[PDB]
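Q: Hi! First time asking for a complex rather than a single chain. Here are the components, and I think there are two in total. Is that enough to go on?
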Amino acid sequence: MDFHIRKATNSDAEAIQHVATTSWHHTYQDLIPSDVQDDFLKRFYNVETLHNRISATPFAVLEQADKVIGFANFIELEKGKSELAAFYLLPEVTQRGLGTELLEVGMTLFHVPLPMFVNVEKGNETAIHFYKAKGFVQVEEFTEDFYGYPLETIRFNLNH
Amino acid sequence: AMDFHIRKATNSDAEAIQHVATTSWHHTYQDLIPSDVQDDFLKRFYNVETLHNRISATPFAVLEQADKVIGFANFIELEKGKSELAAFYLLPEVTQRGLGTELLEVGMTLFHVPLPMFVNVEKGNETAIHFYKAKGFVQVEEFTEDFYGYPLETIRFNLNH
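A: Yes, that's all I need. Here is the structure of the assembled complex.
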């Protein structure tokens, strides 16, 4: 089936909320209590906050069958460096080369500078594998206090 | 008066943030806590490596003027759509100029920080207390912190407008 990657608009807020919520509930199921996940999702992925985020910094969406199935948020950090601030696919659309397209095409659309950094929860083996497969390399590792919970995080960069 | 910027912290800012925290601590806690004890806290939470991690993982804003970081704020999540101002420091030299108001308000914008936001303040820090009350913060709790065996009378405030 054909897919398209495109710049996001404010209208995409509900779809982005859904992708993030579905992905969180699936990936964090053994890593973070549900009530904490939902608190974060309600705080950062409510529609109002998403309008502000989408307006402030570049989001790309992956769409297929007229449905947004993935999204990426790129943020410029300082001269010549950027952060992959958010990157999610629905679990149903993984392992099909689409994450690679979202990343590479999103970076083109927004002329994203390299190095680009990403924080990844150390427990998300699927995400760790993906970033390593795309050529990301570890720079730092630390434990985040996330709602009072330890979240072990690996920070990677991509520079080619 | 001069131009100033409020912006997100970067890893490079770690040394300057350490300096602001250290200068502010030594000034405001001078009659309360010995400096060697203050310095142990600063070593634990404001060493450069820990700051790199905190800057990567959590909302950190800096106030910059004449090319120097002169203040910073760190905002952390609480449950139920609440926030905490986990750190809010200005150099003693840049207080009373309207700059803390900007750091707080613009810092909140940059990171989409929701109200209510809570902050803990030492009871005898008349300057900080006046600042929070002036911005419309309201006391909601009172407690004594054990700080390396020293009592620190603390007032907890929040802002919700």
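A: Helices of chain A lie at 13-27, 34-44, 47-56, 98-109, 125-133. Let me know if you'd like any chain examined more closely.
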